[PDB]
């Protein structure tokens, strides 16, 4: 469920960033990034790292 868990994280981070909670959105994205580094694809790891850069 590694894929299933990563999609759940992206859902919370997208909810948080649109609600106006960027600090918690970064917290979720950092958890999702650690998952992609350990057991993930380059395409999804670059996606998370990109989203973090936009957050600033």
């Amino acid at each position: 469920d590694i894929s299933e868990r990563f999609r759940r994280l992206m859902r919370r981070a997208d909810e948080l960033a649109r609600r106006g909670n960027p600090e918690e959105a970064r917290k979720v994205l950092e958890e999702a990034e650690e998952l992609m580094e350990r057991y993930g694809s380059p395409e999804l790891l670059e996606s998370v790292r990109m989203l973090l850069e936009v957050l600033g």
């Binding site: 999609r7 992206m10 859902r11 981070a13 997208d14 960033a17 649109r18 106006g20 960027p22 959105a25 993930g40 694809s41 395409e43 999804l44 670059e46 996606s47 790292r49 990109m50 989203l51 850069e53 936009v54 957050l55 600033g56």
Partner: protein, 202 residues
Amino acid sequence: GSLPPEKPKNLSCIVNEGKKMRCEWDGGRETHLETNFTLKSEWATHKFADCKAKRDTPTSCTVDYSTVYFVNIEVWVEAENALGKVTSDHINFDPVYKVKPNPPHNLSVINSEELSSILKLTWTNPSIKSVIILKYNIQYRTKDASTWSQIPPEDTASTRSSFTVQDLKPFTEYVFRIRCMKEDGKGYWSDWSEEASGITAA
């Protein structure tokens, strides 16, 4: 006459597997003025890097930022010349639904001349299989056939490395080709793969 830019219409975006996100639009009527096009982007409140379309491709822009999946971004085009600045209608989408995969490679017929009525196929899915679940479209025909026959798309509807084509005539040579796309139907079809051949034995 010299006119301000028309509002850009028909804004679509496509993520070709391996390339960055590219978006296209219709610039509208000829303004007879040097017009600059910019593709603005953002996620939540946070803005992406602006994309300025090259002069050779004035209705297309390929962003500089890596493709981002499973979030909802907002895109729109901003056209401007000496006579005014207009923006298109904003679009909101998840780039995961705008993927055009690469066709599967290594298409081969494993058990040529083994069974009379069946031939098994194998291929290698594109790397984008890590993000989306692929649905396929397998076609086959005889060597002398003018039209292609279709494998029912309802069976080739989930990510898979192989397929066993049944109900083939004995000791006849067949050709196959396969394309793939997101199982939702939300995305773009890949091009056709390299053709694979095989014989059915007697």
